[PDB]
């Protein structure tokens, strides 16, 4: 019903393509992705005998796991759609509505652009490495630690980034139509 | 029936109260449920202490985490929502057959700000700020002189701690404006 409640009050591009891609991301996140990151810390392996070196090295290289960045991102970009829907809902039950609608799609592009930026700086590209070298205290000189399932995590990382990039373009095209029509 | 219950809660509210307060409430619940609840999944499983003394890990973990963060947020969310459905059924009881409606409403928004302030106060005093440390030094019995123990995911837990505090602080501001916005109309 939440899906069927937001069916109306949109343009042909905004009718479906944004919505189907949004459903696409959630299905990938829930059905498939969350079991890949299930044992991110359980199978983190470091070659040392120092107690506590594993905890600090894992926390240093993964300040926040990918699945929870995407979970945050989905929540943020969902609110402007939801908020405008209920905003127009009670009055129904032109200039102002146009003012709100363009603002609604203006926030989406901001959030997705902001979040794609974070992955790039934080994780230094979209590819995961098999080996990480760690020298934070209490670890001795330098320690080799090994990541769990690096290849599978890369595949979903690329998949999510590419789909997010598509959603940016669709929002932009929706904006330009509303720009020319004024 | 999350949509249905709040739909009744939506009735007889001011602009900011109609939209902004309830969307923030769903915002906090979503973060707590789908994201944060499994950051703290292995609080005690990956607590690590550098000692050979049996039971030092149990006493040191309990000394530094008297109550978990997620279980404080759960308690806070329960408390701040009770006045919501308290009035909902109370009027439904009366309806089944202004000032009283006024008296109930201003009291309701007065308890919400009280509970949020009190709970937000507990985090500060009991955890000494909003930032967790990688290392905790423990000397409670039966541990020998002083033992180093290491926390699990200190950086991630800090991120959600800040995010929860910031959102809770906003809910206080909206409630305060609601009181001022309401009082002037009289």
Residue numbers in the entry:
A (entry chain B): 8 to 100, 129 to 217
B (entry chain A): 5 to 101, 129 to 217
What does the report in the manuscript say about this coordinate set?
Connexins form large-pore channels that function either as dodecameric gap junctions or hexameric hemichannels to allow the regulated movement of small molecules and ions across cell membranes. The hemichannel is composed of 6 connexin subunits arranged around a central funnel. Each subunit consists of 4 transmembrane helices (TM1–4), an N-terminal helix, which lines the funnel entrance, a cytoplasmic loop, two extracellular loops, and a short C-terminal tail. Here, we use cryoelectron microscopy (cryo-EM) to determine the structure of human Cx26 gap junctions under increasing levels of PCO2.
To examine this more quantitatively, we carried out a further classification without imposing symmetry and with the same numbers of particles from each PCO2 dataset. As the N terminus is located at the interface of two subunits, we created a mask incorporating two subunits and again carried out a process of particle expansion, subtraction, and masked, fixed-angle classification as above, but using four classes (see STAR Methods). From each dataset, 125,000 particles were randomly selected from the final D6 refinement. These were symmetry-expanded in D6, and the same mask was used for particle subtraction and 3D classification, with appropriate changes in pixel and box size for the 55 mmHg data. Red boxes indicate the full, extended N-terminal helix (NT) position, and blue boxes indicate the truncated, raised NT location. The remaining two classes in each data set represent intermediates between these two extreme classes.
